[PDB]
Every structure is written in C-alpha cells, then in structure tokens.
Amino acid sequence: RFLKVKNWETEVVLTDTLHLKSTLETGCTEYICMGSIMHPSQHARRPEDVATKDQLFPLAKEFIDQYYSSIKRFGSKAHMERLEEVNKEIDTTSTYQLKDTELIYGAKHAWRNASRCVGRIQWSKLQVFDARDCTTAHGMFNYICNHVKYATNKGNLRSAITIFPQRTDGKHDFRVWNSQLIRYAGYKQPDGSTLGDPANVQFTEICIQQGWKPPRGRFDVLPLLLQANGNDPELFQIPPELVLEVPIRHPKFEWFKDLGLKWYGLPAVSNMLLEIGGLEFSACPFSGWYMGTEIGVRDYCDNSRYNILEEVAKKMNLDMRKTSSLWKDQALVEINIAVLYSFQSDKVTIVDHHSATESFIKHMENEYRCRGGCPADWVWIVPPMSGSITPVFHQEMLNYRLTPSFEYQPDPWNTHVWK
Amino acid sequence: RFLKVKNWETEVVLTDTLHLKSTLETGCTEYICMGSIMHPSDVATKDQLFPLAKEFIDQYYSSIKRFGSKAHMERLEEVNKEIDTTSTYQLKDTELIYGAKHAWRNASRCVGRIQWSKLQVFDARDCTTAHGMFNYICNHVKYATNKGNLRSAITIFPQRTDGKHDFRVWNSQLIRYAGYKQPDGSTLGDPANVQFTEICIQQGWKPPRGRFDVLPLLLQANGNDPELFQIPPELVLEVPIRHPKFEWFKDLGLKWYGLPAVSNMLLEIGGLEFSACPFSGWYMGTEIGVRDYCDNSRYNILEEVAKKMNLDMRKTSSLWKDQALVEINIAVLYSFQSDKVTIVDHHSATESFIKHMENEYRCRGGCPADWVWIVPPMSGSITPVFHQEMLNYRLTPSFEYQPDPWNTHVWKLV
Ligand code: HEM
Ligand code: HEM
Ligand SMILES: Cc1cc(N)nc(C#CCN2CCN(C)CC2)c1
Ligand SMILES: Cc1cc(N)nc(C#CCN2CCN(C)CC2)c1
Ligand SMILES: C[C@H](O)[C@H](O)[C@H]1CNc2nc(N)[nH]c(=O)c2N1
Ligand SMILES: C[C@H](O)[C@H](O)[C@H]1CNc2nc(N)[nH]c(=O)c2N1
Ligand SMILES: [Zn+2]
C-alpha cells in the first residue's frame, strides 16, 4: 500500500501509490526478476480477434470511468449516458468508437504511461491527428506526409501522433510496415559486408521485392510501405523536401565532415500498437525529437548498426591495439559531440543526455507529487553512455504497466496473407 | 519449465532452468518490478535451520557426485544431531570452501565471476579476539596483494550464535581513505567515509587529516566492543595516478589502493551466518575512475580535470563531463598497468562475463545476473553485457547485506 524509491545522490525519497492501479503482469515474480528482458510478458487485456461482450465491455468501462474521473465527473449525466452508448455500440457492432476528447486523452496518457521513455515531461503537449476516416494506403500516405510536415516544422520539432482506424476482426488491420517513418536502407553486399543500416536489411529487401528501385547508398531514405484495411501494402516515396536531414560535422575536427555521415531530424515510431479501453490501434505513428545518444551511441556505434567506432578512432590517431587504451570510449564521446553540435548548428531540435535525464528527474518528482507515482524502466531510462554521471543512474525506479499504453506487435510480414 | 534469454547483438539464445532452484525473494511482484531498488525488502530456530542445512548438504554432495551415498547420509545424520543438541552446527572445511566459492558464483551483481572457482579460503573460525582478527586480516592482505599480482581470497570468522556475540569488521572495506568534514562545509578525503572516520576518531584514532589517509581497522570479536588497529603501511599497496599524455595529471595528487576488499557483508551457507567474512579480488577500472573519482558525492574531480583540459564547461552539450571522464579512466588503467598491479578494464571484464554466462548456462542451467549492476557505469552500450538479456534470482549460499554495526551494537564499556 506503499513503496518508496530513493535517490542515492540527493537522498530524496518518494512514495508510490500509483502502482496499485497497475493492470497487467511485468513478467517478474517474487523469485525471478525479468527487468532486462525486452519482451518479458504476453499478458494482454483482450484475447485474439473480436472479443465477446463480456471481454470488451469491462475494458471499455474502465477506460471511460478513468476519463470521466480525470475531468471531475464520474457518475455525471454524460458519464452514465456514455456507458449506455458504449454498451449499445458493442451490442450492435462488437466494438465501439472513441469520442475525440477520449482519443486525445488516451493518446496522451499512453505516452505519460510509457515507462521506457525519458522524454515524458512533455507528455501533455502532444498534437493528436485523428485519421480514423482513412480507407486506403493513398490516404494513409497523405496523413503521414502531413504529420511529418507538421512535426518537423522547419527544425522546430513538435510532438505528434496520427491515429488510423482501430483493429476490427484482425484481418483488416491498418499497418505501417516501416519501423519508423524515416529510416535508411541496408543492403547485403556480395562479399558479405552490409551497406547502409544493417537493422533494415530485411525490410529493405521487401521494398525491393515490391518494386522499389534502390540507389544503393549508405543513407537511402526508405519508401513508405503502407497497409490499409488488411490489403496488400503499397509503396510511396516521401517527398524529400519533407525529410529534414543533418550533415554531421565536428566543432574541432575539420576532418569529421569527410566521413560523410548524416542523420534525419525526426524520430517517428510507426510499428507499435496503441491500446485504449480495449481498442487496438495497430497504426499509430508518433514522433518527438532526438536525444543525441540515440544517434551518436546506438545508431552510429552499435556493432550491428553503422558501427563507425573503428573509422573515427583511426582519424583520431588513437591506439587501437588493446581495449584498455579506451579508444572506443574516446571516439564515442567525440561522435556524440559532433551529433549535438551539428543538430544545434542547423537549429534542429535535439536534447543531450544530461539535460534529458535532469528533466526526467523533475518529471518524476512532478508525477509523484500530483499522481502518486511514475512507472519507469531504469534499464531503458539510463543513457547508453556516461551512465553514472547522469542523475537517473542514482535514482531508484518502480516499473509497472498502466493503461492506456503503447505495446509491441508482430512485424506484419510474419503474419500477412498476400492477395 | 524453461525461460529463454536473448542477446540482441548476437541473436544467441540461452535456456535457463537453474531459476527453478531459487526460494528467496527478489523483491518484485507479478505486477511491479523493483529491479533498480538497491535494497529491496535475528537467529534461526532449530525448525528453520534443519531444512536449510539439508538443502546445502544435499547440493554439496550432488556437486561431488556422491548424492545418496553412505557418506552423504551419515553427514545429514551428523548435522541433524548437532542442530538438535546445540541449536546450530559446524561446517567441514570442504563444505566451507565450497560454500564460499558458491556464494561468489551466485553473486548476481558481480561481473568478475569467471574467476569464481579460483578463490583462496582462509578458515578463521578458531578466532576469539580482535587481536586475532587483525592478524588474520593482515595475512589476507599480504597474500591477496602478492606484490601487485593480485589473488582472490576470503577470510571467514566464526558464525553468528545468539546474535549477541557477532564478529564484525566495522570497516566497509579493509582499505579505504578517511573523510573529514571541514568547518566551512567542505570535505577532505573521501566523503563516503565521513561517518566511519568520525567513529574511529571517537575510539581514539589520531587522524593525519590528509586527502588519502588509510583508515584504521575497527574490529569486533564475539560481540565485544570493537578495537582499533593500524594496518602495517608496507602491506598497503597504492598506485599514484598519472596520465600517458597529460603531464599535468600527476599534479592532481591522485592515488588509489590496489586491493578491493569488501568487509561489511554477510556470508550465508546452509542457514549459518558468517557476519565477518572479508573478501577481495582486483579492480575493474571504472570502479575507481568513474564512481570513486567522479560521483558527485565522492572525490568529484570532473570539474578540476576538465579545467586542466581547457574544456568549455558553460554548456552541458559540449559533453565536457563525458570527455573528462574518459581521460580519468585512461589514467587509472595506465597507472595500474605501469606499476604491474592487477586491474581489468570494463571492455575486457564484460566480454569475460559474457563467456562465463554462456558457460554457466551450458554446465549449470543458468547464471543469475543483475543487469543494473553488471552494465558498467560508463560507455554502457559499447560493452556486450548491455545487449545481453539476463535473469535475476537469489541462490544460496549467498552474500547478503547487513546493518551497519554502530546502529545495532550495544556498547559495554563503563
Ligand atoms: C518529445 C521528445 C521525446 C524524447 C526526447 C524521447 C526520448 C526517448 C528515448 C531516448 C527513448 C529510448 C529509445 C530507444 O532506446 O530505442 C524513448 C522511448 C520511447 N518513447 Fe519517447 N521521447 C520523446 C517523445 C515521445 C512521444 C511523443 C511518444 C509517444 C507519443 C514517446 C513514446 C515512447 C515510447 C513508447 C518509447 C518506448 C519504445 C520501445 O519500447 O521500443 N516518446 N523515448
Ligand atoms: C576477481 C576479480 C573481481 C572483479 C573484477 C569483480 C568485479 C566487481 C564489480 C565491478 C562489482 C560492482 C562493484 C560496485 O559497483 O560497487 C562487484 C560486486 C560484487 N562482487 Fe565482485 N569482483 C571480483 C571478485 C569478487 C570476489 C572474490 C567476490 C567474493 C568472494 C566478489 C563478490 C562480489 C559481490 C557480493 C558483489 C556485490 C556487492 C554489492 O552488492 O555491494 N567479487 N564485483
Ligand atoms: C517518439 C520518439 C522520440 C525519440 N527521441 N526516440 C524514439 C525512439 C525510438 C527507437 N525505437 C523505439 C521503438 N522500438 C520499437 C524500436 C526503437 C521515439
Ligand atoms: C571483491 C570485490 C572486487 C571488486 N572489483 N569490487 C568490489 C566491490 C565493491 C563495492 N562495494 C561492494 C560491497 N557493498 C557493500 C558496497 C560497495 C569487490
Ligand atoms: C538486454 C537489454 O534489455 C537491451 O539491450 C536493452 C537495454 N536498455 C536499452 N535502453 C534503451 N533506451 N534502448 C534499448 O534499446 C535498450 N536495450
Ligand atoms: C538506483 C540504482 O539501483 C543504483 O544507482 C545502482 C545502479 N547500478 C549500480 N551498479 C553498480 N555496479 N554499482 C552501483 O553502486 C550501482 N548503483
Ligand atoms: Zn523485476
């Protein structure tokens, strides 16, 4: 009925009661902790495809209850009517439709509840685009182009989510097949090396197999591969003037520009599922702005990604014979300096890991003060470099699953039956 | 039943069955994870002790391929008699060695466990006085230090009886530097040790009031009041920190000690509790260079190093802290290696741990591991453990936390 978390740097202690409202399993038990498992749990709130009434209505009522509680009604005329309305809708279609206010509330609370996101101090400043009238992949492309243009905003980035029609029977899903709206292709080379982004090799081959003509470069913006109402997906080229990119250079190393590195400005996750009141929105691309380490540490320096540490260390004239010279650590810092300096030079929104983690601590305090807790996944929140010199490293966190939420979902090529 | 862990860099999958053998709590529930909680939330009765002892003896005889043997059954017989008649029992030397090694093997927060089976166990269960403890600890330090060629070792003092006669080393490690709070609010030496430094001074220690004073040993035998002892200085190996490129780094006056020797934990074997069990290995560089030197509440040297580096400290996004952190850690490693004092960098150490993990899953069915502690405090994702899924569970024998002695000791003098 109370769990404390301590900050070992400041000795601030916070007391969590929000976890009493947690809905589904974390994967852990009294005897085993799964805190570093990427997908520890298959506990879902509704089964399979179209639920029965007693499966869907309880989840709808819980969400509608929560929304009307949040606005200081509950039991109000409108709340009770809304319940009866959802009841008849489920009775007569096996599903129900969210009001615009409920949709906005649900999307913001899914972000507020995302325990792996260090950026949630921003959660209530989210632009919600209702795309539930969409019917074809051409319409999805139009909605996505507008999202990208609004969110990019000539570099002054703005958080947004575009929400396509919810799942019905499971055979008419709307899906963005891309993992992010904007990523670079990867190509398997004949000798066995990889050109471009190795993580995207499989998705790139699907695009090529669907007729995409690849330029076969290191930074080829992938097409959109969009699926509407369960049909076969269709390819679309994002107008390049909508794709803001930042050439990476270094404030001291004149030679850094000659590595030919660039990255895109808009991080826009498009493969997750948005769950609100038992409704599943299988296409719901959302975007914010980057923390530098996402590009500078993971995208650039993961061994299975662009893996650039060896090349940077060379130009730096570092001793690479032994691990203990820390040549990887030293190149890693310089790369992240360049990423930040380049984005900032071009006035493209970006946040460094010191500022972001500091904001998150402030967000945690805010959430404990007003909400009685903040679900947080230490394994994901602590940045992938310089961990203990950021404040979150020293902050204990409780992780639990609240709804509405963002969920993982299978890649659609593993499940789609082609027509 | 099986649980799978995946490495997201290599796609290697490992199957854990060993978790079925755990019976002590992690702190998590089915609906909350407390994996980042440092300390998630007293003498056993006869009835409590019997099953704990059986489980240990069973696993010991299993490990030596004599489960079910006559020797196995007579040992269980003998143990139960001792509990029945004395309310406790005594480990054979072989079981003590096995138990100590396996508490190490089971330490989910230790990245250095590839070495677990090479541990020198010093049986100090005949000790009766603080003078005896000092002698045992001096010999441990000398053996472990080995002129820089460090060797892992543990020294095990008598087990708890009624809880009123505990053996305790009051120090948190055998070798640490003092900390002194100044009148003006500043701190000289190690801020983490200010409280224990004050206790020492109160007990009669005359402090030099320098930045790197090796603390005296504060030793408690049989539940008596603890007594002060000065470790002979020639047994305390230290490394002056210099940098391979920055000639000014040596002018910072930094040094550290070579032997990491944890002395405030409790060793639990077969339900028996060894409250004084100091153990030592060798350092991973980041322990000194990231935490001891750069934690804001420790020596906190980032500012001074970055100044000497002429870094721009006006904005955080210059990553001046990150830049200075790396150079400090280069200096630590270079200094120890130059003086031929054993040390391991975080890249080598985490690679070894991955190989140790694989091996443990193959020969033992798993390896409990605390990702939050195993991942080094700098350069996290460029080490292989970052990408390694891990399962955390509590196996016994184990090393456990215990309260600080000055919070529970009832003083006997005057
Ligand atoms: C506005 C600035 C934002 C910043 C700086 C930020 C930062 C981050 C970072 C660094 C991660 C870890 C990414 C990784 O390692 O793969 C993350 C994850 C995540 N973010 Fe945010 N974020 C922002 C906005 C948003 C928005 C607008 C949403 C949703 C509406 C969101 C939802 C999520 C979710 C669900 C995850 C977890 C993804 C997963 O489990 O794979 N974030 N965020
Ligand atoms: C031989 C080389 C060894 C290396 C390189 C090593 C490495 C480490 C490191 C880096 C930590 C984390 C320290 C911290 O962040 O505070 C740790 C923790 C730990 N080590 Fe090892 N270690 C070694 C030997 C040993 C030995 C010999 C034992 C016991 C016999 C041991 C038992 C432990 C335990 C119980 C912890 C957890 C401490 C806690 O929770 O505060 N280690 N080790
Ligand atoms: C909105 C947003 C802002 C930001 N700064 N980063 C991200 C991200 C990411 C990285 N994805 C997360 C989703 N996962 C399925 C794959 C990896 C998202
Ligand atoms: C044997 C050993 C080798 C090594 N490289 N590091 C350590 C440590 C530590 C840090 N202590 C651990 C005990 N905890 C109570 C406080 C913090 C120990
Ligand atoms: C195994 C481990 O959980 C996995 O590598 C995680 C660790 N922490 C992470 N943290 C973030 N922000 N992003 C990630 O992709 C990961 N990967
Ligand atoms: C709050 C968090 O659990 C705490 O800061 C931990 C994080 N991981 C750690 N990891 C190691 N090796 N040592 C530590 O002291 C800590 N501290
Ligand atoms: Zn857990």
Beta-carbon separation of A31 and B26 below 8 A: yes
Helix, strand, coil abundance in chain A, percent, nearest 5: 40, 15, 45
Structural tokens at position B127 = 């000790």
Beta-carbon separation of A379 and B372 below 8 A: yes
User: Residue B377 and residue A382: Cα distance in Å, rounded?
Assistant: 10
**A133, HSE (Cβ side, Cα atoms, 13 Å):** 5
Separation in Å, CA B310 to CA A410, B305, B320: 50, 9, 10
Give φ, ψ of A205 to 5 degrees. -65, -35
Tell me which residue has its CA closest to atom 8 in ligand 2: B110
- List strand residue ranges (DSSP E) for A210-312, in order: 224-227, 234-236, 245-247, 262-264, 268-269, 273-276, 279-281, 286-287, 290-291
Structural tokens at position A195 = 């050109």
For residue B183, the Cα-to-chain-centroid distance in whole angstroms is: 33
Closest alpha carbon to A90 in A129, A64, A128: A64
Which residue is listed with tokens 């190795």? A198
* B366 CB within 8 Å of a chain A CB: no
Angle at B89 between CA B87 and CA B90, to 5 degrees: 155
* Binding site membership of B401 for ligand 5 (Cβ less than 6 Å): no
What number does the ligand 6 atom closest to the CA of B287 have? 12
Structural tokens at position B293 = 């030197």
Structural tokens at position A5 = 């978390």
Strand-pair partners of A162: A129
A120, A124, A129, A130: CA torsion to nearest 10: 110
From A180, A271, A302, A379, the mutation candidate for ligand 5 (largest count of ligand atoms within 8 A of CB) is A379
Separation in Å, CA A227 to CA A129, A418, B61, B329: 18, 11, 61, 51
From A182, A269, A353, A379, the mutation candidate for ligand 3 (largest count of ligand atoms within 8 A of CB) is A269
The answer to whether residue B113 is catalytic is: yes
CB A157, CB A266: distance < 8 Å: yes
Q: What is the DSSP letter of B301?
A: -
CB A233, CB A177: distance < 8 Å: yes
Strand-pair partners of A161: A128, A286
ω before A404 within 30° of 0 (cis)?
yes
Q: Where are the alpha helices (DSSP H) in A250-398?
A: 292-293, 300-301, 309-315, 327-345, 353-371, 378-381
Q: Determine how many CB atoms are found less than 10 A away from the CB of residue B171.
A: 24
* B23 CB within 8 Å of a chain A CB: yes
CB A261, CB A315: distance < 8 Å: no
Strand-pair partners of B120: B153
Q: Ligand 3 centroid to A187 CA: how many Å? A: 22
Burial B333-350 (b: 16+ CB within 10 A, else e): bbbbbeeebbbbbbbbbb
Structural tokens at position A147 = 């999202």
Which helix (H) or strand (E) segment holds residue B240: the answer is strand B238-240
Q: Where are the alpha helices (DSSP H) in B1-112?
A: 46-63, 70-86, 93-105
CB B261, CB B173: distance < 8 Å: yes
What number does the ligand 3 atom closest to the CA of A289 have? 5
- List strand residue ranges (DSSP E) for B238-394, in order: 238-240, 255-257, 261-262, 266-269, 272-274, 279-280, 283-284, 343-344
User: Residue A313 and residue A9: Cα distance in Å, rounded?
Assistant: 34
Q: What is the DSSP letter of B365?
A: S
Q: Ligand 7 centroid to A107 CA: how many Å? A: 27
Give φ, ψ of A175 to 5 degrees. -140, 140
Q: Is A105 helix (H, G, I), strand (E, B) or coil?
A: helix
CB A45, CB A26: distance < 8 Å: no
Separation in Å, CA A248 to CA A385, B31, B131: 19, 43, 64
Structural tokens at position B289 = 């260079």
B63, burial (CB in 10 Å: exposed 0-12, middle 13-18, buried 19+): exposed
Strands A350-351 and A290-291: parallel
Structural tokens at position A416 = 């789609």
Q: Is A242 helix (H, G, I), strand (E, B) or coil?
A: helix
Closest alpha carbon to B398 in B28, B59, B144: B59
* B312 CB within 8 Å of a chain A CB: no
Closest alpha carbon to A276 in A66, A75, A127: A66
Strand-pair partners of B24: B394
Beta-carbon separation of B323 and A337 below 8 A: yes
Q: Is A154 helix (H, G, I), strand (E, B) or coil?
A: helix
Per domain, the residue ranges of chain A are: 16-132+159-169+273-287+357-381, 133-158+173-244+408-412, 245-267+290-355
Which helix (H) or strand (E) segment holds residue B122: the answer is strand B120-123
Restricting to B residues 384-413, those with a Cβ less than 8 Å away from any Cβ of A are 386, 388-394
Order of strands across the sheet with A279-281? A279-281, A273-276, A405-407
Find, in chain B, the residue whose alpha carbon is nearest to that of A401. B31
- List strand residue ranges (DSSP E) for A29-170, in order: 127-130, 160-163
Beta-carbon separation of B26 and A30 below 8 A: yes
User: Residue B151 and residue B141: Cα distance in Å, rounded?
Assistant: 10
User: Residue A130 and residue A105: Cα distance in Å, rounded?
Assistant: 12
Strand-pair partners of B110: none
Q: What is the largest CA-CA distance in chain A?
A: 74
The conformational region for residue B53 under phi > 0 = left, psi -120 to 50 = alpha, else beta, is alpha
Length of chain A: 419
Which resolution, in Å, applies to this structure? 1.9
Q: What is the largest CA-CA distance in chain B?
A: 74
Dihedral sign (CA B6, B10, B11, B13):
negative
B216, B219, B224, B225: CA torsion to nearest 10: 20
Separation in Å, CA B231 to CA A294, B176, B234, B263, B342: 48, 11, 8, 15, 21
Strands A13-16 and B3-6: unpaired
**Which of the residues B23, B284, B290, B322 would you substitute to probe the A interface, choosing the one with the greatest number of A C-beta atoms within 10 Å?**
B322
CB A27, CB A41: distance < 8 Å: yes
CB A352, CB A386: distance < 8 Å: no
Q: What is the DSSP letter of B91?
A: -
User: Residue B299 and residue B283: Cα distance in Å, rounded?
Assistant: 18
User: Residue B311 and residue B292: Cα distance in Å, rounded?
Assistant: 22
Separation in Å, CA A363 to CA A47, A111, A396: 34, 13, 14
Closest alpha carbon to A263 in A214, A335, A187: A335
Structural tokens at position B389 = 């899924």
Residue A354: list chain B partners with CB under 8 A.
Answer: 316-317, 321
Strand-pair partners of A130: A163
Give φ, ψ of A141 to 5 degrees. -60, -45
Residues ≥6 apart with Cβ < 8 Å to B303: B313
Residues ≥6 apart with Cβ < 8 Å to A390: A353, A354, A357, A358, A382, A383
Length of chain B: 414
CB B197, CB B178: distance < 8 Å: yes
Amino acid occupying residue B181: K
Dihedral sign (CA B194, B197, B199, B201):
negative
CB B333, CB B285: distance < 8 Å: yes
Which residue is listed with tokens 């493209």? A348
The conformational region for residue A48 under phi > 0 = left, psi -120 to 50 = alpha, else beta, is left
CB B273, CB B255: distance < 8 Å: no
Q: Determine how many CB atoms are found less than 10 A away from the CB of residue A30.
A: 14
User: Residue A415 and residue B107: Cα distance in Å, rounded?
Assistant: 42
A88, burial (CB in 10 Å: exposed 0-12, middle 13-18, buried 19+): exposed
Residues ≥6 apart with Cβ < 8 Å to B208: none
Beta-carbon separation of B330 and A332 below 8 A: no
Give B378→chain A minimum CA distance, Å. Answer: 4
Give φ, ψ of A15 to 5 degrees. -120, 120
CB B315, CB A351: distance < 8 Å: no
Mark the binding-site residues of B, compressed into ranges. 36, 110, 173, 282-283, 287, 372-373, 386, 401
Q: What is the DSSP letter of B147?
A: G
